[PDB]
Design a binder for this molecule. Structure first.
Ligand SMILES: [Zn+2]
Ligand SMILES: [Zn+2]
Ligand SMILES: [Zn+2]
Length: 178
C-alpha cells in the first residue's frame, strides 16, 4: 500500500484499502473511514465496482437527467467521490473552510458556501437530488469569481471549478460534446 494519503499526500495515521494500494487519513476519505469492516474497500474501489457491475452506466448521459436523479445510495456515493476528487487538488484549501468577505469595492455573496459545509450536508443526507449537491459545489466557485472581480486571485476559482467539472463529467458519464 501507499505510505501517503491519496487525498492530501501526507504521511500520518493511514488506513489502507484491501482491494487497491491506496491509503487514507480517517477524515480525508469520504465517507470517513469506517470503524470495522475487514476487508475494507475505498471509495475508488466502490466506484469501480458500480461500473463493472453495469458497464452500460458509462454510456453518455444528459446533464439535465443526471441532476434530477434522486440521491439513492449509488448517487450518494458518486457525489461523495466527486467531492473527494476536488479535495485531492491542493488548491481546494482555499475553498475548504468558511470564508469571510471584507475587500474594498466588493460585497460578500448572499449565500456563502464552502467544501466542508458540502461535506457535512452530504454526511447528514441533506440533498435529495444530485442537483442539490451540484448547485452548492458550483456556487462555491461562482461566489469566488464574483467577489474577487479583476484580482488575479479569481483564477483559483476557475482552476478548482475546472477540476470539479471534469470529474463530474467523468463520474456521471456525461455525453461527450464539442
Ligand atoms: Zn489525508
Ligand atoms: Zn481501493
Ligand atoms: Zn447493467
Amino acid at each position: 500500500n501507499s505510505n501517503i494519503c491519496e487525498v492530501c499526500n501526507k504521511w500520518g495515521r493511514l488506513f489502507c484499502c484491501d482491494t487497491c494500494p491506496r491509503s487514507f487519513h480517517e477524515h480525508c476519505h469520504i465517507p470517513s473511514v469506517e470503524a470495522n469492516k475487514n476487508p475494507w474497500s475505498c471509495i475508488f474501489c466502490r466506484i469501480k465496482t458500480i461500473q463493472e457491475r453495469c458497464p452500460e452506466s458509462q454510456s453518455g448521459h444528459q446533464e439535465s437527467e443526471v441532476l434530477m436523479r434522486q440521491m439513492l445510495p449509488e448517487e450518494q456515493l458518486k457525489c461523495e467521490f466527486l467531492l473527494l476528487k476536488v479535495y485531492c487538488d491542493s488548491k481546494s484549501c482555499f475553498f475548504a473552510s468558511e470564508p469571510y468577505y471584507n475587500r474594498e469595492g466588493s460585497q460578500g455573496p448572499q449565500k456563502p458556501m464552502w467544501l466542508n459545509k458540502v461535506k457535512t450536508s452530504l454526511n447528514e443526507q441533506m440533498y435529495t437530488r444530485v442537483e442539490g449537491f451540484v448547485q452548492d459545489m458550483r456556487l462555491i466557485f461562482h461566489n469566488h469569481k464574483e467577489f474577487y472581480r479583476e484580482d488575479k486571485f479569481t483564477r483559483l476559482g476557475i482552476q478548482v471549478q475546472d477540476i470539479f467539472e471534469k470529474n463530474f463529467r467523468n463520474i456521471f458519464a456525461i455525453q461527450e460534446t464539442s
